[PDB]
Amino acid sequence: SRTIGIIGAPFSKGQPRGGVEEGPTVLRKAGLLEKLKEQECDVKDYGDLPFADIPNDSPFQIVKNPRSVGKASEQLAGKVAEVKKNGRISLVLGGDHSLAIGSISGHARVHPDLGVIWVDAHTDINTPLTTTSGNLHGQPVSFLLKELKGKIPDVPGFSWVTPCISAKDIVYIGLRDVDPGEHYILKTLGIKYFSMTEVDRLGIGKVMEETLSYLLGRKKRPIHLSFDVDGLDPSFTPATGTPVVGGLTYREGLYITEEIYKTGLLSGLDIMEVNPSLGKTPEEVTRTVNTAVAITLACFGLAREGNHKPIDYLN
Amino acid sequence: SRTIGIIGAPFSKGQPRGGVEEGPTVLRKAGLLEKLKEQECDVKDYGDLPFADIPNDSPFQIVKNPRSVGKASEQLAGKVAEVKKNGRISLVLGGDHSLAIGSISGHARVHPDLGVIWVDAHTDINTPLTTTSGNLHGQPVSFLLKELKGKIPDVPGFSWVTPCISAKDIVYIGLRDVDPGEHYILKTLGIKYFSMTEVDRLGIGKVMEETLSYLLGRKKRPIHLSFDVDGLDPSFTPATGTPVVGGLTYREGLYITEEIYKTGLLSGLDIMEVNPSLGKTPEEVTRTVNTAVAITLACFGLAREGNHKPIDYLN
Amino acid sequence: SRTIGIIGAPFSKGQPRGGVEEGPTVLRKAGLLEKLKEQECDVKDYGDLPFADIPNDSPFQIVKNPRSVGKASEQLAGKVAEVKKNGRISLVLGGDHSLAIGSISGHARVHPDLGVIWVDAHTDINTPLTTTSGNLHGQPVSFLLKELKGKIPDVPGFSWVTPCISAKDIVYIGLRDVDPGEHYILKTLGIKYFSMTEVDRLGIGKVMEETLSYLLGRKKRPIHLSFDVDGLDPSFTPATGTPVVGGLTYREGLYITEEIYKTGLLSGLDIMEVNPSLGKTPEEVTRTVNTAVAITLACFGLAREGNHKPIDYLN
Ligand SMILES: NCCC[C@](N)(C(=O)O)C(F)F
Ligand SMILES: NCCC[C@](N)(C(=O)O)C(F)F
Numbered sequence: 011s012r013t014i015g016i017i018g019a020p021f022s023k024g025q026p027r028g029g030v031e032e033g034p035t036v037l038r039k040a041g042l043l044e045k046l047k048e049q050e051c052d053v054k055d056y057g058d059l060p061f062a063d064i065p066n067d068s069p070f071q072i073v074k075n076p077r078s079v080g081k082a083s084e085q086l087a088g089k090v091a092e093v094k095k096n097g098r099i100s101l102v103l104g105g106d107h108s109l110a111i112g113s114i115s116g117h118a119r120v121h122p123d124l125g126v127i128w129v130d131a132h133t134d135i136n137t138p139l140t141t142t143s144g145n146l147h148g149q150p151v152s153f154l155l156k157e158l159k160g161k162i163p164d165v166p167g168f169s170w171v172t173p174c175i176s177a178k179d180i181v182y183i184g185l186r187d188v189d190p191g192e193h194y195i196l197k198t199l200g201i202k203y204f205s206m207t208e209v210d211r212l213g214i215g216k217v218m219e220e221t222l223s224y225l226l227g228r229k230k231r232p233i234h235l236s237f238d239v240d241g242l243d244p245s246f247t248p249a250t251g252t253p254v255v256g257g258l259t260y261r262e263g264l265y266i267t268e269e270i271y272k273t274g275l276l277s278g279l280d281i282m283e284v285n286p287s288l289g290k291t292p293e294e295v296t297r298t299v300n301t302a303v304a305i306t307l308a309c310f311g312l313a314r315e316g317n318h319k320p321i322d323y324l325n
Numbered sequence: 326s327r328t329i330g331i332i333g334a335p336f337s338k339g340q341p342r343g344g345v346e347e348g349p350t351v352l353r354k355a356g357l358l359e360k361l362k363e364q365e366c367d368v369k370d371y372g373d374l375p376f377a378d379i380p381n382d383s384p385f386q387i388v389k390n391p392r393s394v395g396k397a398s399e400q401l402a403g404k405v406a407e408v409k410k411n412g413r414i415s416l417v418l419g420g421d422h423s424l425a426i427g428s429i430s431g432h433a434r435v436h437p438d439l440g441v442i443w444v445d446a447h448t449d450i451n452t453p454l455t456t457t458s459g460n461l462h463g464q465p466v467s468f469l470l471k472e473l474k475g476k477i478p479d480v481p482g483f484s485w486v487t488p489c490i491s492a493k494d495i496v497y498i499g500l501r502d503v504d505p506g507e508h509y510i511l512k513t514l515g516i517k518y519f520s521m522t523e524v525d526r527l528g529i530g531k532v533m534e535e536t537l538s539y540l541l542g543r544k545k546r547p548i549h550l551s552f553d554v555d556g557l558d559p560s561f562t563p564a565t566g567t568p569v570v571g572g573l574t575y576r577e578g579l580y581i582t583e584e585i586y587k588t589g590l591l592s593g594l595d596i597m598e599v600n601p602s603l604g605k606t607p608e609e610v611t612r613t614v615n616t617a618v619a620i621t622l623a624c625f626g627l628a629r630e631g632n633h634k635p636i637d638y639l640n
Numbered sequence: 641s642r643t644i645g646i647i648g649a650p651f652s653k654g655q656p657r658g659g660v661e662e663g664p665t666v667l668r669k670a671g672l673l674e675k676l677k678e679q680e681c682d683v684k685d686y687g688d689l690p691f692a693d694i695p696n697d698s699p700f701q702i703v704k705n706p707r708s709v710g711k712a713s714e715q716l717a718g719k720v721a722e723v724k725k726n727g728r729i730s731l732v733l734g735g736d737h738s739l740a741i742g743s744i745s746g747h748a749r750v751h752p753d754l755g756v757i758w759v760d761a762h763t764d765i766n767t768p769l770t771t772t773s774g775n776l777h778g779q780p781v782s783f784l785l786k787e788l789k790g791k792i793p794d795v796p797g798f799s800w801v802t803p804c805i806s807a808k809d810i811v812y813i814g815l816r817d818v819d820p821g822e823h824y825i826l827k828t829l830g831i832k833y834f835s836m837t838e839v840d841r842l843g844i845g846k847v848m849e850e851t852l853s854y855l856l857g858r859k860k861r862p863i864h865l866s867f868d869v870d871g872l873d874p875s876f877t878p879a880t881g882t883p884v885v886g887g888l889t890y891r892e893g894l895y896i897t898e899e900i901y902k903t904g905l906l907s908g909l910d911i912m913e914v915n916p917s918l919g920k921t922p923e924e925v926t927r928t929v930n931t932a933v934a935i936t937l938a939c940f941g942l943a944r945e946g947n948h949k950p951i952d953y954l955n
């Protein structure tokens with residue numbers, strides 16, 4: 011049986027565009043909890059984290075909303091660790107991707123040996139000093155890498171953060187818009203990644219084989235999947251802040267998650283960057299949310315070949 | 326030379342939505358016969374089977390229109406066997422997929438050693454007792470499997486049916502919406518299938534290699550291809566009753582058929598579930614019909630790399 | 641460092657539809673030169689070739705605008721050779737594909753050992769005697785193949801042409817609409833090609849591996865990439881004269897070019913068949929031009945995994 015611990019993270023200050031804080035709302039409204047239960051899922055909803063308003067939050071150099079972002083992650087990290095302690099797979103509904111800082115931090119407290127699979131069109135590994143946008147949803151990974159600590163200045167709101175993952179414990183999938191400073195870090199720390207170029211070259215099947223083999227090779231350990239919806243092509247998830255054409259297909263998106271599910275090691279899951287406000291049409295909103303639900307459902311068992319209970323259907 | 330035996334099957338009572346009985350009409354109207362002849366094809370049109378109206382046809386338990394469905398298949402089976410006896414590849418233009426019962430039955434009378442390749446988003450293998458919709462276009466395969474006879478209650482209209490294929494003589498390609506009872510049967514009878522998950526993992530090239538090797542391995546035998554248009558992604562065949570996103574691409578659709586054609590063993594072909602009435606726009610109708618024609622034309626020789634007659638074009 | 645030699649070729653008489661002569665305009669207007677410079681690119685723009693109007697140009701048999709087409713290519717060939725002599729990668733912005741005759745001819749004068757990679761939905765290898773359309777953008781390759789000289793009648797405007805490539809020095813990628821006479825030539829001269837069928841079967845990664853291995857195997861030599869935008873699926877490049885569904889994806893398009901770039905052998909590049917007038921909407925125009933720019937930028941270094949200067953971004 012697979013127990014789920016739902017955590018709503020209606021937060022948007024890791025980026026400029028509002029509306030992404032509605033992500034938990036539209037996803038639940040789409041019947042996510044219900045559909046999860048329609049499967050062999052034991053679902054416990056921990057509600058939506060109430061992210062107090064931090065009015066005084068001027069930029070730190072160019073990094074925007076550091077205190078707001080830092081606090082939201084701090085709050086989430088605690089809630090995530092709480093759900094993990096209850097022996098449940100934490101399902102964080104975002105909210106912008108900056109929340110990954112708290113989600114992965116909290117997860118690592120209960121499971122320090124975790125491995126991260128990051129599905130995104132971006133590496134979100136800019137440091138406060140390499141970022142040019144100042145948007146924190148483009149910097150979460152820098153705050154989590156042990157090898158980058160020291161390159162991370164003390165940004166207000168993140169004194170609680172302690173890098174908990176090594177460059178070797180994370181795999182990127184779907185990259186197609188990487189900043190120069192971000193690429194330097196990729197090549198410098200020797201981070202394992204499968205940009206869209208690698209997916210084209212190898213095919214999603216080999217990509218996933220290499221991903222799980224790379225992270226689970228030596229030994230088995232909890233898997234944290236941080237899924238940024240803009241990792242999938244905009245044709246499937248248009249209502250998102252930073253879309254980039256030439257993304258992972260709906261099928262590849264489901265393949266990734268089906269395979270991760272089959273490992274039986276999914277321990278933490280993030281469904282980020284869904285912003286209903288950015289849908290150019292009501293259908294772009296449903297299309298985005300629907301795809302987001304599908305990916306989530308696959309993470310927890312829904313297989314395209316079919317599913318059946320341990321019963322004799324013919325009798 | 327390849328001789329074709331066209332059979333129109335304007336039938337829709339295997340499902341709720343009407344309009345699919347217009348399939349033969351829109352396909353012929355698209356120049357299918359003509360385009361087939363524009364190739365090295367010897368085409369003989371046997372017209373549209375006149376499916377008498379069966380007014381008294383109340384559900385059998387929950388199975389809807391059993392007598393209407395059963396009769397249409399019985400009629401088709403005879404016409405199909407007739408075309409086969411004339412040494413022609415039977416091309417059945419549907420019509421809902423319930424017709425596969427008659428199409429495959431009739432084919433198997435003249436060629437009992439046939440192997441079936443089923444391209445569909447569904448397995449259509451529900452039995453009258455496992456189906457929840459009661460729609461017979463979701464049960465054709467159950468009536469044809471020898472191993473399932475005994476699990477098939479005597480449904481009015483199907484006393485003429487005799488299972489003619491074993492679980493080992495059929496291969497599914499494109500599955501992405503399989504019912505629980507259907508999956509049980511898949512795993513229980515050991516049926517060979519390549520859901521969308523397998524296509525993603527292996528690629529359509531290996532998928533097809535494994536399909537033909539699995540069916541033609543031991544020895545060569547007639548191939549029956551039952552192609553449900555909803556097997557292809559709805560982006561290519563929207564005007565269909567039961568569309569499911571994340572389907573086979575137009576390219577994969579053509580690859581499947583080009584490869585099947587190259588075997589020189591195509592013996593029976595079904596082009597099912599095309600419903601012009603379900604097109605949200607006149608373009609969705611043409612898009613659907615056009616793709617349906619393309620797939621058909623590929624089954625009979627049209628190769629994307631090109632075709633040329635046994636002549637010296639340079640002279 | 642990679643030096644670029646931009647050449648605008650606003651020419652359309654190799655085909656019926658006007659507007660393609662606006663290709664250089666819309667591409668430059670899209671910031672192509674600027675974006676190229678935004679990379680490690682040394683860009684020198686040689687302007688748009690002024691293709692004098694040739695009023696008297698009646699068909700030669702059925703071949704249309706032979707003198708106009710022949711002259712434009714003759715002019716381009718000279719400009720191309722000029723740019724090559726300046727040690728620059730020639731970037732020809734078309735204009736219809738008939739220009740490939742001049743582009744490849746001029747390139748071969750400075751680099752006779754060149755190898756051609758032809759990305760297109762068509763083989764454009766019809767001879768004046770095999771063509772049925774009479775449109776010269778469907779005949780460029782016939783005029784360039786040494787093995788076909790003798791099958792090429794003396795068409796007004798092409799007395800300057802001298803076949804400069806052998807059937808063995810060119811690879812086609814993306815074929816899906818090949819004329820009968822064109823296919824005969826393919827199979828007769830033993831030309832290496834990867835129609836869409838081969839791409840489906842092997843995947844773009846192996847396709848490219850085989851392409852570069854086939855052309856660069858024996859030894860390294862300059863690469864001429866003639867990219868017809870209709871090689872990519874119409875979903876990405878709709879504003880083009882002869883679109884064909886089931887084309888190369890945006891991703892495959894970028895993969896092809898990224899790999900060609902990685903060889904460090906790109907010597908000549910053609911971006912052809914972009915026709916703004918054929919966009920059914922202003923967005924189809926931008927979509928087409930944007931994709932055309934992306935492909936170009938990838939040819940010169942833009943990698944989806946990211947790019948970074950030879951600096952220490954962390955410091
Ligand atoms: N999650 C979005 C990341 C986008 C980003 N790389 C950034 O750092 O802001 C770009 F906008 F430069
Ligand atoms: N050909 C459609 C099959 C759909 C079906 N599996 C069915 O049996 O009706 C679903 F509706 F449950």
Ligand SMILES: NCCC[C@](N)(C(=O)O)C(F)F
Binds near residue numbers: 764
């Ligand atoms: N570049 C377009 C080629 C199209 C063509 N093969 C031709 O030769 O015109 C067809 F129209 F027949």
Ligand SMILES: [Mn+2]
Binds near residue numbers: 130131240241252
């Ligand atoms: Mn992203």
Ligand SMILES: [Mn+2]
Binds near residue numbers: 132134147238283
């Ligand atoms: Mn992200």
Ligand SMILES: [Mn+2]
Binds near residue numbers: 447567
């Ligand atoms: Mn179906």
Ligand SMILES: [Mn+2]
Binds near residue numbers: 445447462
């Ligand atoms: Mn079906």
Ligand SMILES: [Mn+2]
Binds near residue numbers: 760762868871
């Ligand atoms: Mn073309």
Ligand SMILES: [Mn+2]
Binds near residue numbers: 760762764777868913
């Ligand atoms: Mn061309």
